[PDB]
RNA sequence: UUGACCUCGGAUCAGGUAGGAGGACCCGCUGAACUUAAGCAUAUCAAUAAGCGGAGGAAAAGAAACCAACAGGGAUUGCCCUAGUAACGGCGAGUGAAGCGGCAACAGCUCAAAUUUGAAAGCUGGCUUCGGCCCGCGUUGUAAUUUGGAGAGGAUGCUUU
RNA sequence: AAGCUCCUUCGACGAGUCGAGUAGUUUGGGAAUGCUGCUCAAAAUGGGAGGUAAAUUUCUUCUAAAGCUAAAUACCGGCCA
């Protein structure tokens, strides 16, 4: 029993995509979510994990819908910032 | 002649004796999910018990045939969950 | 290998140990016409009469399990259709 | 004659979904606003959000076509049509395999 | 229009993958791998060897398939592959020798089931004539038509063909994007590794005149 | 027996026109390597060099097709937002993960 | 290869001379029954199938119908005079047919047949 | 010829008339007991080819047996089970043979041909005195009937290397350690 | 009213049959675990031990839907060899045949599928002066002929009881 | 009554059984090694098993779903020696 991070196990292209992967040991990129909307998205996912099991289908659906709205607002703000950068 | 009286007696005796004494949801799931289509449904509906007389036959014999004409089709836990949720009342 | 003169052997009576006699052909066809058709045979008959030869072949293969058996059964059903047309 | 490579009306793949998503369980895309990608590569939104009153009414009296299955194409649950329900009833009873 | 290709000019191509009555489990696994990889194809098994090749042709006509991939197992030990352009197209026989299927845990590669591959053809497939024919048939077989909507849209795997001695070698790799250091490709093997010795090329659908005979084939 | 003329006429009957002038890479989706790769493989038996030569040829074809796909604008990068069916099972992915973890644990445990 | 109970499944050969003398007494008893007749029936000369033993020949099961007819011995009467008959075998070669015909002719020339009752 | 026509009917047993007859007879068999006596067979052609004779001492018994799994499958066939039940029912008779006669969604139906060994017509008939001999006691119990041979794999070829001469006997022969005097 | 045919039952009617025992060897069903792999889970132990049913002096198997690629062999069975080969396998532990060849012994047959149709020629029982009289079975098929390296039917001329 | 020879005459050969899909069990044996259970369900120039790259499934060898049968073989049991 040893930590997978220490173990040099390469990522594998399962159903969950690997996407683009950083070269090993050289300058992992930094992405900021300093935006309040991104804060709210990740915080809402954290609170979803905190709540966990719920006995109401309606409550589960509304939780999912709220955090989906979180991603939607984050994506809209990212698109607006991309448009602003293209203008500049 | 017509046998109506004797059939009446047989049915009355059968009623007196009676007084004295998942598959559908699986098929619905297979139709809903892109697994089996209409042509496949009729193809599977052409079974060994197809063209079973059911209207002009006596009730007791029809009940016996209904007891012993059940084909065993595979079932799924999803279908079991669906039927449990359907049968769950208020 | 070795050079030996081959002989001509007598025809074994075990050849054709199935059926090819006209009497058995008569009996088989008469039993066909007295007994009728199975549900799937009648389904394929309807398909062939409507003209869906491909659909009939596929259904026969699905019911039988072998391409050769499907082709053969389509053949008997086709001559039955032709004979019924001639009889009418 | 040269074979024209066309789906027939009886083919298994005669109608295939636009979602392009395979046999994956629906546990994925629950948190994502879209359902998969199309041929061109554009994601497919959820159709709409169900009303609380409508959901409560459905739970109290599930519709005739209710199956408890989420549509692979759209976020709304998949519901069987009246013709499909009649087909299932005919298959279950065995009284008429083919009409007319 | 139900040819199920949404494209400007359609590449109507279809593959019927057929197996024989005595195929080994390794060969069935290979059949499953190519069936997963080929999304315009139909799987079918247990063709009687006592039947006829033009009977395979009516089978392909029944399935409306313009290409057929036939797996003939001899001795239950040796694979024979037939690539045929169904209606009146020339057919190629190869012998498959060395077999490695996707289910082995030493590949460490995975891709989309049906996504379009990068067809990586060797140069001999570009100079040599019977290799011209093999390249054309292989392109038509693994062509994965343009607007065919039973395919996923993002390219992530490479199907590479390469002859070394006189034998076609097939490789399947996954493209992995890693950003460049102040993004390029690493290929990681996925699956079917099967070694091909060409044997014959006939002009007809499954018969017809013989045009190439590989006069270096030593049979098991 | 090698009837080159007949091979050419049969390929003429078969041929689907493949011209970069006329037909897009999005259609034909084929890359022809300039090298024969039999020079790249010195000896057939040497598995490492054979795999490296196939790696090189496949990589060159992949880069060429990638450049053509940018030239055409067709999407090429499968996003992290996407989940779809794999050609092999997530169970197989879990098993290969287990094997890799076991090998690594054995190695650094031997070091320990 | 002693994973199992060879202790319970070991069987010895201390009765070898006993079985030998029993077999000798059995063939002597057969001779006493068929006192003037030979103990074993005449058998044809056949060839070993496999390539490793082609050049060698051995004894068969019984003579072929064509060989019997050529030698002039009836099918129904040959077993009564002690000739094994095999209906399954076929000649397929004039060499083997002639060899078996010569063997049967030698048997006829060396055989004395008694006149029924 | 009538037996040939009956054989053709049994070949096309899924036809309309045969399906109707098996339906009616299945209802009758369900109404009767699990085991019952037939003086005359339901399929005379099949009985005749299996060996039934129009003699005093030959009887048919019709038996219904539960079908389905025992996921452990019961290695003895339902035919063998029916024959064994017939043996315990009438231990006096000898099981000549058996043949499937009908089937249902719960029961499968067999007819067994049985021979009386103590009747002197059977003793006299030299084609049946073999089953009159005492070696054939409870052939159904020892697996000596057709179903027994089929389940024991008593066939020739490389496909039946392990069972052509008896599974347990072959195992013993292969696992005996033979030691000669002069080793 | 009467008499059949079919089916289902009763009789302390007449004649027989099945238990149980034994189980060394034999034919089936069912079926473990310890152990080994210096841990253990697949595997092994083992298609074994226990349990259940069924015979004989032997049982079983047995006259190819076989072996084979031969210049062919020719029911089954047992020994030697094939051979620790092929083949399979946490490819570790390990498992593990068969053809051929030398032998011992050697034996082949009965049916269903045919119309005796110019003659049910077949068989059970009880009644006997024991020689031949009935009753019943049976045509929804008992005798004779025939069983596919065959045969039938005529003609034909030899040879056997 | 029987064996033959000849022929301008005939020559019937075993079905929920093969086979396909599938679960269990078993084997050295996914051409599923054999078997059992479930669904479907055959053919008559037929069917089975093999040979073969040789150019199309050519060629070889047998007839499954009825049955009998002594001898060579095992034997801690029975009657003895």
From Swiss-Prot, chain D:
It comes from the Eukaryota. It is found in: Nucleus, Nucleolus; Nucleus, Nucleoplasm. Coiled coil: none annotated. Belongs to the WD repeat BOP1/ERB1 family. Component of the NOP7 complex, which is required for maturation of the 25S and 5.8S ribosomal RNAs and formation of the 60S ribosome. Component of the NOP7 complex, composed of ERB1, NOP7 and YTM1. The complex is held together by ERB1, which interacts with NOP7 via its N-terminal domain and with YTM1 via a high-affinity interaction between the seven-bladed beta-propeller domains of the 2 proteins. The NOP7 complex associates with the 66S pre-ribosome. This is Ribosome biogenesis protein ERB1.
């Amino acid at each position: 029993v040893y930590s997978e991070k220490e173990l040099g196990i390469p990522q594998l292209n399962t159903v969950t995509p690997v996407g683009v992967t950083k070269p090993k040991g050289k300058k992992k990129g930094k992405v900021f979510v300093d935006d309040r909307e991104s804060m709210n998205t990740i915080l809402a996912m954290v609170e979803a994990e905190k709540q966990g099991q719920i006995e109401s289908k309606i409550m589960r659906a509304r939780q999912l819908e709220e955090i989906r709205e979180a991603r939607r607002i984050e994506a809209e703000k990212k698109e607006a910032e991309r448009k602003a950068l293209l203008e500049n | 002649e017509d046998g109506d009286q004797l059939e009446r007696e047989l049915d009355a005796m059968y009623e007196h004796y009676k007084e004295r004494k998942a598959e559908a949801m699986t098929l619905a799931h297979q139709l809903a999910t892109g697994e089996k289509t209409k042509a496949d449904l009729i193809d599977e509906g052409y079974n060994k018990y197809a063209f079973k007389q059911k209207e002009g036959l006596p009730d007791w014999f029809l009940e016996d045939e209904a007891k012993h004409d059940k084909p065993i089709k595979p079932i799924t836990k999803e279908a079991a969950q669906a039927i449990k949720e359907k049968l769950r009342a208020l | 290998g070795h050079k030996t003169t081959r002989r001509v052997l007598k025809e074994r009576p075990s050849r054709r140990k199935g059926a090819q006699s006209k009497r058995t052909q008569f009996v088989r066809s008469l039993i066909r016409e007295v007994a009728g058709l199975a549900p799937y045979e009648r389904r394929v008959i309807e398909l062939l009469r409507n003209g869906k030869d491909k659909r009939a072949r596929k259904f026969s293969k699905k019911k039988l399990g072998t391409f050769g058996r499907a082709k053969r059964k389509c053949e008997e059903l086709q001559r039955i259709i032709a004979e019924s047309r001639r009889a009418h | 004659d040269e074979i024209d490579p066309v789906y027939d009306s009886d083919d298994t793949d005669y109608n295939v979904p636009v979602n392009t998503i395979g046999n994956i369980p629906l546990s994925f895309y629950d948190s994502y606003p879209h359902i998969g990608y199309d041929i061109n590569g554009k994601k497919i939104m959820r159709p709409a959000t169900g009303d609380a009153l409508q959901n409560l009414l459905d739970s109290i009296e599930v519709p005739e076509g209710w199956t408890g299955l989420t549509d692979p194409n759209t976020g709304k649950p998949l519901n069987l049509s009246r013709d499909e329900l009649e087909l299932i009833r005919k298959v279950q009873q065995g009284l008429i395999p083919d009409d007319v | 229009d139900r040819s199920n290709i949404i494209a400007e000019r359609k590449n109507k191509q279809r593959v019927l993958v057929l197996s024989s009555r005595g195929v080994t489990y390794r060969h069935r696994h290979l059949l499953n791998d190519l069936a997963s990889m080929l999304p315009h194809g139909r799987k079918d098994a247990k063709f009687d060897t006592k039947s006829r090749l033009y009977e395979l042709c009516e089978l392909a006509e029944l399935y409306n398939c313009n290409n057929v991939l036939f797996f003939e197992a001899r001795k239950g030990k040796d694979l024979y592959m037939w690539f045929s352009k169904v209606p009146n197209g020339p057919t190629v026989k190869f012998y498959a020798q060395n077999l490695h299927t996707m289910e082995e845990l030493h590949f460490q590669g995975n891709c989309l089931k049906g996504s379009r591959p990068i067809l990586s053809f060797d140069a001999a497939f570009e100079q040599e004539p019977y290799l011209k024919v093999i390249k054309e048939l292989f392109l038509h077989t693994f062509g994965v038509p343009q607007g065919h909507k039973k395919s996923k849209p993002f390219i992530d795997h490479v199907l590479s063909f390469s002859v070394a001695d006189g034998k076609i070698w097939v490789r399947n790799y996954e493209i992995r994007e890693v950003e460049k250091v102040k993004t390029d490709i690493n290929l990681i093997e996925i699956g079917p590794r099967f070694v091909l010795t060409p044997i014959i090329i006939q002009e007809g659908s499954f018969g017809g005149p013989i045009l190439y005979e590989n006069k270096r084939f030593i049979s098991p | 027996i090698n009837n080159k003329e007949g091979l050419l006429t049969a390929l003429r009957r078969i041929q689907l026109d493949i011209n970069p002038k006329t037909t897009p890479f999005s259609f034909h989706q084929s890359v022809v390597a300039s090298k024969r790769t039999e020079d790249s493989i010195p000896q057939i038996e040497d598995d490492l060099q054979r795999e490296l030569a196939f790696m090189n040829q496949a990589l060159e074809a992949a880069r060429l097709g990638r450049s053509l796909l940018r030239k055409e604008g067709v999407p090429f990068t499968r996003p992290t937002d996407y989940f779809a069916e794999m050609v092999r099972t997530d169970a197989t992915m879990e098993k290969v993960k287990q094997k890799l973890i076991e090998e690594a644990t054995a190695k650094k445990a031997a070091a320990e | 290869h002693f994973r199992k109970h060879w202790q319970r499944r070991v069987r010895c050969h201390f009765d070898q001379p006993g079985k030998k003398v029993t077999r000798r007494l059995a063939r002597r008893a057969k001779a006493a029954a068929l006192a003037p007749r030979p103990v074993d029936k005449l058998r044809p000369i056949v060839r070993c199938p496999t390539v490793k033993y082609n050049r060698r020949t051995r004894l068969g099961r019984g003579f072929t119908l064509e060989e019997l007819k050529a030698a002039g011995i009836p099918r129904l009467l040959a077993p009564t005079i002690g000739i094994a008959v095999d209906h399954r075998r076929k000649n397929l070669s004039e060499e083997s047919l002639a060899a078996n015909v010569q063997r049967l002719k030698d048997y006829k020339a060396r055989l004395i047949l008694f006149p029924r009752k | 010829g009538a037996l040939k026509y009956l054989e053709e009917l049994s070949k096309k047993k899924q036809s309309d008339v045969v399906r109707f007859l098996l339906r009616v007879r299945c209802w009758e068999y369900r109404q009767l007991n699990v085991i019952h006596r037939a003086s005359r067979p339901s399929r005379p052609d099949k009985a005749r080819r299996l060996g039934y004779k129009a003699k005093q001492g030959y009887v048919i018994y019709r038996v219904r047996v539960r079908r389905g799994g025992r996921q452990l499958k019961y290695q003895r066939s339902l035919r063998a089970t029916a024959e064994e039940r017939v043996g315990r029912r009438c231990s006096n008779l000898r099981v000549l043979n058996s043949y499937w006669v009908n089937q249902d969604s719960t029961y499968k139906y067999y007819e067994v041909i049985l021979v009386d060994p103590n009747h002197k017509a059977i003793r006299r008939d030299p084609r049946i005195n073999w089953i009159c001999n005492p070696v054939h006691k409870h052939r159904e119990c020892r697996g000596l009937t057709s179903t027994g041979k089929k389940s024991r794999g008593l066939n020739k070829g490389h496909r039946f290397n392990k069972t052509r001469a008896g599974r347990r006997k072959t195992w013993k022969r292969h696992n005996t350690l033979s030691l000669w005097r002069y080793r």
